[PDB]
Design a protein around this ligand. Structure first.
Ligand SMILES: Nc1ncnc2c1ncn2[C@@H]1O[C@H](COP(=O)(O)OP(=O)(O)OP(=O)(O)O)[C@@H](O)[C@H]1O
Ligand SMILES: Nc1ncnc2c1ncn2[C@@H]1O[C@H](COP(=O)(O)OP(=O)(O)OP(=O)(O)O)[C@@H](O)[C@H]1O
Ligand SMILES: Nc1ncnc2c1ncn2[C@@H]1O[C@H](COP(=O)(O)OP(=O)(O)OP(=O)(O)O)[C@@H](O)[C@H]1O
Ligand SMILES: [K+]
Ligand SMILES: [K+]
Ligand SMILES: [K+]
Ligand SMILES: [Mg+2]
Ligand SMILES: [Mg+2]
Ligand SMILES: [Mg+2]
Lengths: 527, 527, 527
């Protein structure tokens, strides 16, 4: 494999061209007055999106040297998305700013490694100052404001999310689905999320979403691991005879049973799935007993009144109206369990919470009550066609992620003002040498980029807006949608602290390492 | 000749691309921190220049649609240069701004002709306000400051020009020549500028400067026109026999004599030139008598003691050490006339100034005294090589032109602040309709361009500098060379009013007419 | 004429590539261990040379942007050659160093004009320090040492030049010619150099050297100007009738006579030339009388015993064995004048030197004695073929020019040590701002280039040699030919001060102006 080698400024310029192209494509979507990007799809209608990471992931370049910068910025956006779930456009613009400033400061006497160290020191100081200024969320109005801001100023989505978190709790289960009407609807459904993924990816039955989903399924629970093929065969014969899907929730499934399940599913078409049992020891027994009561089934392998797997009957299995499964977790909602068994269990767990005073028992009994009683919220997104539903689904997912972040940690001022107000924190640093000073100044200049980008997307000169913001009192910021300087907290323009710090950390960490390159090696394009 | 036709936005975009290229090339030279442009020459060393019109005249484009915009901007710069002699970069940047703003405002319902009318109305109001704020020049220190500012901050050139205008008067003759040493020298030489060009371009004896220049020449003066070939032949025989050049200053020279002079010069190589007599009637007789006394010659064709041209002798002609001639004017400096004749004529004119009290006689007698006594100032530009001498000669010419303008009219604040302070004058206008309002707003936005360009060339953000200037008191401006906000008049950063108003008027007049185009027709390139 | 425009770093890099190519070609010839360059000629054998300006003038590049830098360096070398006649390689390497250092220091906040000002200030300080350290030449041994050093270590050329200047004086006439034997010969010939060029270039009779040269010519002298065609015709009839060339030395020749001389020379083939008379007034009469006595002729146009041109006879003209003429000057050597007339004149001028005590008369009478008695030295260069003769002629011309410079002004240490010892002079400067400091540091780093280049051509590491030189006493330098650190003055490694200061001034003046460019405009290559 013959390769091509470039040195210094030429390679830096090509990589900066790639970075600039990707960041210019991403940046047009930022703020309340941002616009959308249309992405061609090979299998049907094009996609319309305002999400930064979605735009970033779809840009590959033909030139080998520009594609390296494009890939590094894609890594920045993807890391931000997997960590916080929001704020990928901010991370992209910060990364471009840091890369450009670092490239412009490389000379014969400069040491880019020390510049990187200074950049990291400045970012750590800024993050500490951000954590100092954070304040917690205490009222549903703040939740609605956060959700409205994250949903691009849509008040209905914020109200729906606030109502959902009021009904199922701030730490409840919330799901987003395609609707079949023109308006949005929230429904609460009883059910459990047991914090367990599938045993095998072969049970997936869809191309979109990467999930295993079944309807009107049988419930099989085993306290012990499944080993014998004749132990599992009669459950598969039962699931086949009723045409119903089957869910297996056992401590584990061995290679021979998993191979038999996968082969029977692939060849015959039985809708069977196996997943790991929730809990450990007594917590595992308790989860199996409670979920079986909610589904009207039995728990196999128990020591008291033992029921074997080899003689399983249709009435020994439970029933569930819908199931959703993924690699990380699974949910069973509308079980057919008798009300008297659920109420008995609920009352027993309510008594047990009062019997002993310890954190572990109290937490586990509260978790069992929450799983049996609170259920899940499902949000259906309305619209006229698939494209609008897909765009609104992106916005709703962003809003839910940001609201969860703002519940975990506090909130700060929105519109990029939180990073502007942390600029004075860099005046307390004493660099060890000139290169660390250069890195600190790079970060100091970078800290203004998000507000300037938001102002530029609104059609005004961002430099004047930022200058006027820095000259005002600490609670005053710029309302880009209205075009006025207002009190940010009173108007509800607020951001989660976690999103801001995650974006800053990821962008700095990747861009400062990028700016240390001297030689680039790429493969020669073939025919 | 087959042609190509384009309509609307495509043609506008191509012409704007040409305008943008030319103006981007020109704009890098603006201000105390501007840089230079290197232009390839076909016959030798490349030219290095900081002059805006020189850069503009050297850019021709291959694309037919971009070259139209380039040519129109070249017309703007050339008109500004021929009118004021300075301020061509400002005119170019103003023209680009007006063209871009006008192109961005063209729609289906817009009427560009009314937009042009509004632009012209706003420019007229701004020019009137500028004339209101002008103040005259009264001290040599102001002259030195103006010359120093126009010479790109070179104090020595300003001091030399101030000394020259002190020695020969504010309305005296000043010339720029190539020096042969490393330093600049001022020398004062007796002589006359008689406000009369050559009779024929065939007498030019150089490829650089487009002038006729001779040394140790004979002087021939005729009160009447020259007609007979035998009247002029004995003077040509005298000029030939001594190998000396000959200058003819007569009321006129006919076709046969001019043809004979041109043919004899072209074939034999006699250094002969003919020019029109200065003055009218008695003023013509007086100029011939005085200049003959300064050169020791006679005046032919006079009624008292008449001397004929047909019997001319060597001692009937005067002598002059150097002569310079062009299409517009000519100068004879170091004449051989006896001191006693000059002093007698000077004393007679000094007496005649006291004899009668009238403007016409007093003005003409003072002009005769000035021509006989003040002479001319010659500045020689020093340097190591031709390129540096050529660049410094450009700067000295700019400084002299600006100083003459600031003597004719007043001065205003420099650095683009004079146009900034005339922005409020546009708030007193009441447009007749919406298109005139659009034109007024175009001019209002344009009035900020020169200061922003000067600030950008200095490495700072021009928007913040302009915003801070507009918020300060009327006498405060930005010193780009020092980087401080200072009192402009005290620091000597001042401009002539004529240059500013000329640049604004030319730029507006051409760009507003450019922005009215809908169809462009060009010739198809050939092979 | 369509043109191409480039901005900033790209244009700078292309121009630096051109500069680097030309300077790398030139630099290989520097020092006692430098090598030669072979240049293809279109009309015959290739040229072999060690002269820097000859190599520089022969390099034109196809790329339009590299050719600009090449042309600017050619201008540097040509200016140095026309000013000093030696030291063009040093000027070229200094110019490349300054250009590279200036290009590496251009950034957004830098002001190249102030950097140029700092460069010029540093160069002025260095030149003043050089003039302080100069010492005059007092002994013939120093003359021989200077000539030997300038002739690339050839002792025979130095001895010949020293003998020539001993025989004709330090300010006598010396000429270089092609020899016809294997060895070099000096011959002293009586004759005069009268400091007058030809009247017309049409008298040139050779393709090589650009000179008019005649043998066994007639001498025509006129005190007054020649006018009548019948006044000059009988001299042309005499010159024709004897087939001899004719020299005309008169106050001037008119257009009709010059046209007649040129036409008769071009059509018939008469070897006639006309030149201006030497001296003014009485000095002109004296030069004509003395040179006529040395040639046995008469002076026409005199008031005492007047001889007319119209009746000229063969015995009224003088005779001269050889004549050399150029645009600047002319020489008549072996005249046929009788010894008794020369001796009479000589004694009369020797008496007149004692009669009155004044500078003007004493100087003019000493000049007349020197012209009548000292003559000229002719050096013939020996060799086997034309190429070797041409190379040795280049070296001899360099040696003569350097010896004349070292007679006019003093001498300094050779080998680049004189510029090294002026580095501390830059520590007494206080720059006004940071850009002037940058320029001063550029000059400080540049001042080491000549010694490093000389050491590199000798096959050793120049950095260590320069470092060891700077740590030694002021009289110690590096002998590149021997490879030892020696006392430079005792070993005779010395340079003229004028050559060093001229090279430094020219290189700085052009390169610092080059480093201020931001835009480059070139013509698009045609087909
Ligand atoms: N009315 C407003 N005025 C000013 N700033 C606002 C306003 N509304 C939202 N913002 C700010 O705009 C930013 C939201 O940008 P946006 O949602 O387009 O991108 P992001 O969070 O960087 O990433 P992603 O593409 O993943 O959503 C936040 O900083 C938010 O505080
Ligand atoms: N120290 C300074 N600070 C601020 N502005 C300055 C300073 N010195 C000069 N100026 C301004 O810079 C401008 C001079 O620009 P410049 O001479 O480069 O171009 P120009 O006059 O438009 O045209 P041209 O190319 O014909 O000279 C004037 O407006 C002058 O007032
Ligand atoms: N033996 C030596 N040791 C050290 N330096 C020497 C020695 N001989 C000569 N030099 C130095 O070498 C330089 C002579 O270089 P050279 O004659 O090749 O080029 P130049 O003078 O720059 O230009 P040109 O090509 O016009 O002659 C001088 O600085 C001289 O002092
Ligand atoms: K976005
Ligand atoms: K300019
Ligand atoms: K050399
Ligand atoms: Mg968002
Ligand atoms: Mg100017
Ligand atoms: Mg030499």
């Amino acid at each position: 494999a013959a390769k091509d080698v470039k040195f210094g400024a030429d390679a830096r310029a090509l990589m900066l061209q790639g970075v600039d192209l990707l960041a210019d494509a991403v940046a047009v979507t930022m703020g309340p007055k941002g616009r959308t990007v249309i992405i061609e799809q090979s299998w049907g209608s094009p996609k319309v999106t305002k999400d930064g990471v979605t735009v970033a992931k779809s840009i590959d370049l033909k030139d080998k040297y520009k594609n390296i910068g494009a890939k590094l910025i894609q890594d920045v956006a993807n890391n931000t998305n997997e960590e916080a779930g929001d704020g990928t456009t901010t991370a992209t613009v910060l990364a471009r700013s840091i890369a450009k400033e670092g490239f412009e400061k490389i000379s014969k006497g400069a040491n880019p490694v020390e510049i990187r160290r200074g950049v990291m020191l400045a970012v750590d100081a800024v993050i500490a100052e951000l954590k100092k200024q954070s304040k917690p969320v205490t009222t549903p109005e703040e939740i609605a404001q956060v959700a409205t801001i994250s949903a691009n100023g849509d008040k209905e989505i914020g109200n729906i999310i606030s109502d959902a978190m009021k009904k199922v709790g701030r730490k409840g289960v919330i799901t987003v689905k395609d609707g079949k009407t023109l308006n949005d609807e929230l429904e609460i459904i009883e059910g459990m999320k047991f914090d367990r993924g599938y045993i095998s990816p072969y049970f997936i039955n869809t191309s979109k979403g990467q999930k295993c989903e079944f309807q009107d399924a049988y419930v099989l629970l085993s306290e012990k691991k499944i080993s014998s093929i004749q132990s599992i065969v009669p459950a598969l014969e039962i699931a086949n005879a009723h045409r119903k899907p089957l869910v297996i929730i056992a401590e584990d499934v061995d290679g021979e049973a998993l191979s038999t399940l996968v082969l029977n599913r692939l060849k015959v078409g039985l809708q069977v799935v196996a997943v790991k049992a929730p809990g450990f020891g007594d917590n595992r027994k308790n989860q199996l007993k409670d979920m079986a009561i909610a589904t009207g089934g039995a728990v196999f392998g128990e020591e008291g009144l033992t029921l074997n797997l080899e003689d399983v009957q249709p009435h020994d299995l439970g029933k569930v109206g819908e199931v959703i499964v993924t690699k990380d977790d699974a949910m069973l909602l509308k079980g057919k369990g008798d009300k008297a068994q659920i109420e008995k269990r609920i009352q027993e767990i309510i008594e047990q919470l009062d019997v002993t005073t310890s954190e572990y028992e109290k937490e586990k009994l509260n978790e069992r009550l929450a799983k049996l009683s609170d259920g899940v919220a499902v949000l259906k997104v309305g619209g006229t066609s698939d494209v609008e539903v897909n765009e609104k689904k992106d916005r709703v997912t962003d809003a839910l992620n940001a609201t969860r972040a703002a519940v975990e940690e506090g909130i700060v001022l929105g519109g990029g003002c939180a990073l502007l107000r942390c600029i004075p924190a860099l005046d307390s640093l004493t660099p060890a040498n000139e290169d660390q000073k250069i890195g600190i100044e790079i970060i100091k200049r970078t800290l203004k980029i998000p507000a300037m980008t938001i102002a530029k997307n609104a059609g005004v000169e961002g430099s004047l807006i930022v200058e006027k913001i820095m000259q005002s009192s600490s609670e005053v910021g710029y309302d880009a949608m209205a075009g006025d300087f207002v009190n940010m907290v009173e108007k509800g323009i607020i951001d989660p602290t976690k999103v801001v710090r995650t974006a800053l950390l990821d962008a700095a960490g990747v861009a400062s390492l990028l700016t240390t390159a001297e030689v680039v090696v790429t493969e020669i394009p073939k025919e």
